[PDB]
Amino acid sequence: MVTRREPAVKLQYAVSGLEPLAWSEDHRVSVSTARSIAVLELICDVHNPGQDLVIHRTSVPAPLNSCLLKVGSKTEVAECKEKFAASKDPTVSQTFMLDRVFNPEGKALPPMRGFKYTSWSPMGCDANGRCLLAALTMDNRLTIQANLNRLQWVQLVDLTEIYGERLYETSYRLSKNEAPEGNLGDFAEFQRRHSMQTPVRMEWSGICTVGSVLLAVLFENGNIAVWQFQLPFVGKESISSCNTIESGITSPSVLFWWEYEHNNRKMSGLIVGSAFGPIKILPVNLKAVKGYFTLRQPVILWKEMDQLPVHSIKCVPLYHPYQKCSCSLVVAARGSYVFWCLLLISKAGLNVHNSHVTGLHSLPIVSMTADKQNGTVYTCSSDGKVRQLIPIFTDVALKFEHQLIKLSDVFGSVRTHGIAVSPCGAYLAIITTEGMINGLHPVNKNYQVQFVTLKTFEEAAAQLLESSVQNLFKQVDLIDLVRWKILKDKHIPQFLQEALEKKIESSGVTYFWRFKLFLLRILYQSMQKEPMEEKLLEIQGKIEAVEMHLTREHMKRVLGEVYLHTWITENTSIPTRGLCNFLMSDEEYDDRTARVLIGHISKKMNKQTFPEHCSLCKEILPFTDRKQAVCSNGHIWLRCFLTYQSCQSLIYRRCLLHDSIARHPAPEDPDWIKRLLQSPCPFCDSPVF
Amino acid sequence: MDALESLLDEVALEGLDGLCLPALWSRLETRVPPFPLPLEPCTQEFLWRALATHPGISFYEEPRERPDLQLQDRYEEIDLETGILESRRDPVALEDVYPIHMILENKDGIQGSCRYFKERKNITNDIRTKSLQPRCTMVEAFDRWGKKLIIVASQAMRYRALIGQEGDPDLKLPDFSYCILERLGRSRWQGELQRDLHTTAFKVDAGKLHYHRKILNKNGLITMQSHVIRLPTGAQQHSI
Amino acid sequence: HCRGMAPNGLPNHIMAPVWKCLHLTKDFREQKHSYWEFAEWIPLAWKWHLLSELEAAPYLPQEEKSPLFSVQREGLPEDGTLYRINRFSSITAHPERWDVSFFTGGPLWALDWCPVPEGAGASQYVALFSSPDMNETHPLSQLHSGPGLLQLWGLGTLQQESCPGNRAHFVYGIACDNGCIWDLKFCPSGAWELPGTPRKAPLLPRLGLLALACSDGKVLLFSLPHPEALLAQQPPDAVKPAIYKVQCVATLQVGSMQATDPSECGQCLSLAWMPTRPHQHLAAGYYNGMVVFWNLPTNSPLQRIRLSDGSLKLYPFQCFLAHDQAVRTLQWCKANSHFLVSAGSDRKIKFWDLRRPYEPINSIKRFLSTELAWLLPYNGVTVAQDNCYASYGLCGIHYIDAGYLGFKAYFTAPRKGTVWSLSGSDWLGTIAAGDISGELIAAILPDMALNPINVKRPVERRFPIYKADLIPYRTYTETVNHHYLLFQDTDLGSFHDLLRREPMLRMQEGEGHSQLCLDRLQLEAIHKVRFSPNLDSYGWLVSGGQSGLVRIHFVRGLASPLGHRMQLESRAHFNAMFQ
């Protein structure tokens, strides 16, 4: 099952920071590196025959200016820094001069502007339908990044800048009665004012219901700042609150969100793990949203303080077959071991079980990933071992069974600096480096990202047919396995065709028509893009037929909403009569529901024309055809594939696959089409941006 | 590729030397795949607004009017014997529109060839407001500046046009190696011959061109073929 | 800047940092050492089994007698005799100058002073390892796992009244089946107690805790009894080389519970104890470049297991890939133990913050380095180079600031050969370094809070201790049969007229111009150098090398009234605390 996928991705700069590889729900892979964040965007390319992974590459630049954590007045801090560095005590003086938090830049110190950590938001956080990237530098600049156009990442906000000012405005006191304004000239208070705002790691919540998302930032002193962002996130404008909770955990290493549901009651908390070993779930006692609620009291998952640093945390929702109820499985990397804890609400409240699955590695675990759909864990160490670790349900709680996957057999002797798993578990991505060659060191070090197939084509095909999520973009990594097979064998495997026809016959929801359209477009590319010409014409005819079907279903739904809201007698933003004419144009499709709907509409429609005009002419556009409109002067305007209005604006939206086009919403548009314009592309479910 | 992107792509496939307005229309008319619009005078105003409203495009007045482009078509593509010969059939080597003058060691990291890079002046804020509203029509712009109006895409757009979507933006190249890549880019479908690059584009030792070309091969930004030049001697020459 | 000349003949502005370092080191140890640690790890007589003569024979280093040598001492009449001494034997100290020389039977590759609390006035010991064979040489990439002997040598108490007529005594050794030892480190404090401590017959008073970096890839931790307590248990007629087979307190090795997969880490190359109370962490550097930390007290079932013999096996709590090549040397920061430095054969020096191991505080690429010293009062580290990549005439010894002060590297001493080993005296603020040229030098650093570029003539701050020459008379026997070692010793009694005295001219004609010799065994080469960490004997130094001779020197000119002042006040305080 595990075999390499063809393109290795070369990295220009050293891999950098904590747990440096991640794979977003949006199929963008980020590697945090000394001079950038490289982002690898996986495209199920339907326009080319190449069997490789089509990886579009972008990067976030490293900052040009080093970040100073604000601890006082610009002069007050300067005299303090002189005092400590000049101190004749070896301890005070060397503690100041060695710790890079106090010294983010210097005369002979390398600048720490590369990236410490990165976290991907859920989808829908961006101004487009996409996810945001939270990025942390090693000089503690925490920033939120988005790729609004395709080409260039822009910083939306710097959260360290805001939080520094908000601490300064409260004299670094969280409760104003609780502490003095301690003198900055005391090294303990000086260190504290740095420690209280040095971010360790951060994680996004799920989407809270108007949408909202939280971001929890963990600080070295055990404070956590819970940011609340309004969605879509557009900058400082969307920051609805910041609230700091004092965890009290000493030397906190890692953070993750716990979110859980039982009896449709929502609950949530923050799980936090110390570098000194223990793991605890905090109740998030403060939040503004009304639909969620929070855990009542902290629960201790591991108490031992054995100083095995909790390097990573992941958790997955599960349904336990024998307890016959939903439960949450937590897995945490602790040194070379995996700690696991299963959390199960019952009539007793929380029932909790835990263990260490042991003997996995002879070196500490350098990265960990959870297969969200199964709880399959992967774990990795710099000796190049990767171990697949399968949760098996037990009459109470779990057992874990595990196996090594031989990267030696696919890449040879290799070092692995990180792993990530695709959102459906289709691929494992690995940061490979030159390994020890028969006990010799490699002379030259070159980081790469490499991919291996975790699933067979037959399992990817089956899981797409039985897909509960029923959106192709949620499953680009599975349809890429299907794509690879079709391009490799230049035919659609018969069992997939037969099963898909059975689904289209027995269910026929537009997801299966979208899946058919994908297979046929990849088939067309496979056969070199006159029996071959006859076959090309045949399957292109089939593509056009199913492409036409998906169009009718969308047009029917649009008119099936024009009929429901107040009649737009001015015909303001939809070519209603043109669409009615287009639907009535043939008797070939018998669907009475459309034919009566256009009856009711055409009864209600105004006798005034309200035609669409070509802006270069102020002459009518007839609405002859799906894709584009033309006028007597010969201008050609594309039509918005969501609303069929002509995209005459100098900027308009394009699908991720460029298979489809959409208009930008305007203030003249009613709310209901401003919502309609947020639909994914009707042909490929990709963001239309 | 979309029509509006195919415009901005063509502006970015010329180097840092950019385009004149008549050169731009010539580039769109000679494009492959074909440009979707008929490029009528009203359309040229629409496309001009698409440039002026785009924040990455920028506009300059150069000290002197640029020559117009030749018919670039390099190859014979016919034979009287069986088949056809697609060997190079030499046009007149008229004065090059884009002589090589590399922008070395630039502090902003922008790279390419431009003979007037220090001498031309920005007129972006004359052609558009800082709110990106266009201040001039195309006919007003060409009336006021003629061929002295030069259109240049931002470095980020220009470098993207050389590496495509699968290419890695983090890769810096030496200025000489970038200027080789840029000299390829503006040739579109009919790449420069390595013979011609060292003989007359860069005017260097073949060892120098090979050496600086190495990095483009190593990172895989370019593709190598043997090709054939049919001389007026009737004999025909091998070149890369 | 303090004017005038010290009575030892150095300028006061050159000596003034040395005098300051006494107070700074005393103030540190009062705060961050302790009088007792690891109270469970105490020696038991039944864990020390005495080997018979027949059983010890595989372990003893194989040369039964030293090379012939003679020692010439500056300004004395020439001796002219050739000495030769048996394995495990010592010449008598010279009556004026108290240098002692003893022979260990093989090339010395590890060496440390047994640390003793201030004022104790104890007997002073060195623990050392000398390889079994003079000419065999071991690859880095492979585990060795052979036999070897850990040797403990008593030097006497090194009081002024004790030094005339002193001799080194081989008190005992431990026969190890764990290959050669590449590093030795004692627990910095709290390991030693009075030999008169009343303990029940199974127990023995504790001399120290000693960690061994073994060439088979693990660290071994021993608790050492005082010799008299062993000899009281030992039979009276026993063999005079006391060779014991001893159970470890713990074996420290990389791995995990039930993880049968053998670690790639390879040989253990270097050690550092945590400099500060309670010394609970021990670090090691490995051939694969990882730095590995063990939490010595750990009860946790995930780190500690007890073997059937009752010894511990400890797995690490933290490891990280410090270097892309063998990490040859570690130093752990005394002033704040959140920080550590390492250097590896990628020829980078990397400073680490152990709270944040993902990126070093500072990486400086340099020449290939053999050992580091981190003197307590100075923020930077002094580095000994292997010459193979340095520009000719610029190879030597460099002090390098960790980076905040931003000074250029300070070229403390040019050396022609590779400096094999380096030791900084915290008490003296001086540094000593051994060369394949067979020369031992010492150097006084300036106060490195102040910019070194003002040090307009560094040569006034360095002096030779001795140089070994081969005098005619590729393998050991062919070299020994045809050469003898002329040791030339400096008059360390004072540094008057230093730059005109012949040992300095000899050294200065060595520096820069002399050519390295490669058609011989390098029999003169010095491999380890160690200043005493103890306040008693603080002015003493030990060194040894390819000859398997080990030599002790008192740097009388750097011993000082403040050291005497501090020794007596510490004696009084110690005598009040323990009686």
Next chain:
DNA sequence: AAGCGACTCTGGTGGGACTCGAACCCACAACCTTT
């Protein structure tokens, strides 16, 4: 005067980039080369 801490002034080497010298290769005309 004698002394000090910047501020220079002087010979020497390496780091990465790049000139260097060589064989290797095209396709043609010359014709030696063959039944």
